[PDB]
Structure 1
């Protein structure tokens, strides 16, 4: 039973959130 559209979209949104976390860490490392 393959995953649904909503699962993919929720995963992509959570990846956007962790991308925000990643750029926060990168900015902290640059400073």
Structure 2
């Protein structure tokens, strides 16, 4: 049974939030 498009968009949004947190940690480690 294949995934749905909404599931992929949900995963992309969660990964975008994770990327925002990654940028925050990278800035905090830099300075």
Runs of 4+ residues over 2 Å off in structure 1: none
Query: How many residue pairs are counted as aligned between the two chains?
Result: 31
Give me the TM-score of the superposition, normalised by structure 2.
0.96
* Residue matched to 2:10: 10
What RMSD, in angstroms, separates the aligned Cα atoms of the two structures? Answer: 0.3
Deviations 1:1-31 (A, max 9, x none): 0100000000000000000000000000000
Give me the TM-score of the superposition, normalised by structure 1.
0.96
The gaps in structure 2 that reach 5 residues or longer are none
